A paper describes a structure:
Here, we demonstrate that the centriolar protein SAS-6 forms rod-shaped homodimers that interact through their N-terminal domains to form oligomers. Proteins of the SAS-6 family comprise an N-terminal domain with the evolutionarily conserved PISA motif, followed by a segment with a predicted coiled coil and a less-conserved C-terminal region predicted to be disordered. Furthermore and in conclusion, because these residues are well conserved among SAS-6 orthologs, we propose that the self-assembly of SAS-6 homodimers into a 9-fold symmetric ring structure is a fundamental property at the root of the universal 9-fold symmetry of centrioles.
Numbering used by the authors:
A (entry chain A): 2 to 104, 130 to 168
B (entry chain B): 3 to 105, 128 to 167
Write the structure that this text describes.
Amino acid sequence: TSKIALFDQTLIASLLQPLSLNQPDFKAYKTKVKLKISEQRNETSGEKELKFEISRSDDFEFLFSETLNNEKYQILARDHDLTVDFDAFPKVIIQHLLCKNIVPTEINIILDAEKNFCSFELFSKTPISKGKIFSIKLHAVR
Amino acid sequence: SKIALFDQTLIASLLQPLSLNQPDFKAYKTKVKLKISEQRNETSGEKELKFEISRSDDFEFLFSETLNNEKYQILARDHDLTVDFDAFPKVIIQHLLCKNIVKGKPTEINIILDAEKNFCSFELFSKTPISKGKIFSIKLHAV
């Protein structure tokens, strides 16, 4: 209804997940993931929300999302030294960061062992470091 | 055994508490001399990387730290560094502190002082479109 699609593309990501519940060492594969970013109105509050959703054909159980409002975003900005405001955030990553990964920015997705959660991480490599920009914890939709 | 790898005056942002009683910070752009060298530890014979900063504004502004391979491993771990101890200084010097040719954004240096000026954090940044892009920080101690 109020939902507005800002971004809907297939990107190459590295997918990591522990070998098992007891073995936290990751196995890692390059994989294609569909990322959708939209804005919507919270039904109870009327406030603006940013929704992130990932899926991939490889695994029907692979359905994750998170919704950020202004306050959730402030926490994110604080934790990652983000320099843009809530309203600018999606526009800048879409226009300056994500377009590069569509089927140098890198995307990592890290799964829970039980696949209840995944961390959606964006990177911009430096000559001496990984250059992690932020990570958002997404939860299983299913 | 000391070998100079880098000896240059750079523009930094200097942050420090208002006073010993006022923890809130004030910020100024300032010129700082940064020296990076390699040397042999006298007792162990191992290679050491020495960072030294100074500035003419304040004679008591004299800070250094020496990193050996082990100290570096801790740094690389804390900051997701992707190069080894031997490459570290060469890459920073050649790719982060270097002057680009006039024909991911420019590097920025932050120096954060202790209120008592016993320690300062030497921080290197490479700005992104949405974030500060802190690369690493090294705690230097008063000389």
